[PDB]
């Protein structure tokens, strides 16, 4: 049925910061997603529709071709694996950084460290690059609680201001890497639908400066 481009967007803050870039490329949403029981959204361009997904599902929809392109945090891409998509643009939006974090002024135990995190693969990779052995525990929800009840010694999370960490008696420890939102594209869609993509990519590129 649909011959155009399907664009996958992350739910919360990314959506706010991306709307400007979309408007500049001719692709405004017709309605507010927050007050809508709707899954596929049309745009002012009739060749583009958008999907509003949990951020960690963006790479999944894109690599499998259920969306032709998407906006995803580099934290998500690093955790997921970005081997099957093209990371075309750093959109320089939703900047933050991946960090380790622990209880305020709590010393490292002498035993093998426990990391409780969403970012299991990033965590393993990072502590490996520091030549350190860790035991990683996967969490799907919020992570600030984990150190406070001894689930892990540290967490790995994305930190912007750090206000959430300090408000819970935690402090940023190590900087892992810098994170921002990226434009990813399906391999096949890049080859088959470049003519539809190019203007939108040029507009995004220009909107960034």
């Amino acid at each position: 049925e649909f011959l155009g481009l399907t664009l996958a967007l992350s739910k919360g803050r990314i959506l706010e910061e991306t709307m400007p870039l979309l408007r500049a490329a001719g692709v405004e949403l017709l309605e507010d997603p927050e007050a809508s029981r709707k899954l596929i959204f049309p745009t002012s361009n009739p060749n583009v529709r958008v999907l509003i997904l949990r951020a960690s599902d963006v790479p999944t929809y894109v690599e499998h071709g259920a969306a032709d392109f998407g906006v995803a945090g580099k934290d998500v891409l690093l955790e997921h694996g970005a081997n099957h998509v093209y990371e075309l643009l750093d959109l320089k939006i939703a900047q933050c950084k991946l960090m380790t974090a622990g209880v305020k002024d709590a010393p490292l135990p002498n035993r093998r460290l426990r990391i409780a995190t969403k970012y299991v693969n990033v965590a393993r990779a990072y502590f490996a690059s520091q030549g350190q052995q860790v035991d990683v525990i996967k969490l799907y929800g919020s992570m600030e609680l984990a150190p406070l009840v001894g689930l892990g010694d540290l967490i790995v999370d994305v930190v912007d201001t750090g206000n959430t960490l300090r408000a819970n008696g935690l402090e940023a420890r190590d900087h892992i890497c810098d994170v921002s939102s990226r434009l990813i594209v399906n391999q096949v869609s890049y080859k088959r639908k470049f003519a539809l993509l190019e203007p939108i990519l040029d507009s995004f590129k220009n909107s960034i400066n």
Partner: protein, 378 residues
């Protein structure tokens, strides 16, 4: 799941079709002068992973030889075995090899890709000339054309030498090479442009990504230092010859991507990647590599042809149980002679053990009517 991810039965007509493809394609290679070799599935890692990439090592399952305590692998690729074989048997002149055999990978390439491909290939050792690469293309396309597919093979040519010479002449670090390669792989033109403003000869690296597809004019867009490198000139010349040959001789759609740098490790020159329709993973991967011995070749997963190839409907025949058991001995002998003849022509004839004995996919009965055994459809 019953079977592991990336591991599948090939059953019934698919298996029959796989057997036909393997056999026909092998025979074609043999008739082009390629010597068939059938190395084993396992070797000591000393030989199997000699000068292997890190990737090939991770892809190769390890097992222990209980007779020596030494480490063996299950092959993930046949080409190193062809190297071993050519070292012992091939001499200094030209040698041609082909093969078809199962290989196993620890992890899939591609989402839902196979870990158990039936790897078929051809390799030419001991010839420096671009003529060896052209012969391989001819062999490959003759094989593809024999398959009578409606699916179209698109060919992508690359040439790793170009970027490697630019990386040398511009004296790039490991870090900077990795970053350009990552940016090339992602077709990230904006960030590439930025990184290239602050690199020596960065203009040439940007040109590869932006204008590499237009191989007729690539040389003239390159810097003076690049244009005076003989290896860069020869590489671009090789690309132009293969491209022309493919279009003229074979009416092939050819794209050029000189930023295609998969297997930076093993490839030493020209590379070929054949894609079937819009499938992400190449059906055919080939190109120049190392044997001081010259080598070029290709390989493919025969099993990936199954979806794009067709055999005629088979004739599956059941002899009528009751009629047969009513025959005298001399009548039986004549029927069996007739059945033998049908089987020689490729009819699948079941001699029933019982009255309920029913071949799957039955198409005909061989029945007795008047004084005569004859086929009738069901």
């Amino acid at each position: 799941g019953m079977l592991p991810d990336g591991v599948a039965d090939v059953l019934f007509e698919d298996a029959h079709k796989q057997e036909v493809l393997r056999h026909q394609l092998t025979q074609q290679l043999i008739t082009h002068g390629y010597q068939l070799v059938s190395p084993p599935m396992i070797e000591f890692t000393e030989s199997l992973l000699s000068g292997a990439s890190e990737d090939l090592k991770r892809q190769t399952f390890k097992i222990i030889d209980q007779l020596t305590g030494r480490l063996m692998g299950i092959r993930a690729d046949i080409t190193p075995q062809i190297l071993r074989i050519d070292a012992h048997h091939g001499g200094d002149g030209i040698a041609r090899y082909c093969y078809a055999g199962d290989v196993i990978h620890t992890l899939p390439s591609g989402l839902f890709g196979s870990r158990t491909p039936l790897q078929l290939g051809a390799e030419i050792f001991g010839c420096e000339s671009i003529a060896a690469d052209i012969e391989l293309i001819d062999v490959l396309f003759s094989m593809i054309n024999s398959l009578d597919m409606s699916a179209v093979l698109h060919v992508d040519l690359g040439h790793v030498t170009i970027f490697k010479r630019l990386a040398e002449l511009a004296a790039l670090s490991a870090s900077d090479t990795e970053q350009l390669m990552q940016l090339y792989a992602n077709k990230n033109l904006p960030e590439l442009k930025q990184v290239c403003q602050v690199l020596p000869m960065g203009s040439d690296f940007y040109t590869l990504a932006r204008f590499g597809h237009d191989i007729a004019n690539l040389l003239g867009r390159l810097s003076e230092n690049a244009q005076q490198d003989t290896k860069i000139v020869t590489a671009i010349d090789e690309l132009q010859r293969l491209k022309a040959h493919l279009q003229v001789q074979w009416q092939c759609a050819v794209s050029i991507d000189v930023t295609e740098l998969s297997g930076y490790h093993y490839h030493t020159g020209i590379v070929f990647n054949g894609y079937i329709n819009s499938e992400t993973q190449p059906l055919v991967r080939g190109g120049r590599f190392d044997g001081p011995r010259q080598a070029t070749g290709f390989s493919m997963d025969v099993s990936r042809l199954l979806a794009h190839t067709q055999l005629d409907a088979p004739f599956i025949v059941l002899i009528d149980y009751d009629a047969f058991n009513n025959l005298d001995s001399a009548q039986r002998q004549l029927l069996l002679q007739q059945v033998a003849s049908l089987r020689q022509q490729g009819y699948r004839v079941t001699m029933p053990l019982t009255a309920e004995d029913m071949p799957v996919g039955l198409t005909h009965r061989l029945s007795l009517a008047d004084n005569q055994w004859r086929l009738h459809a069901v």
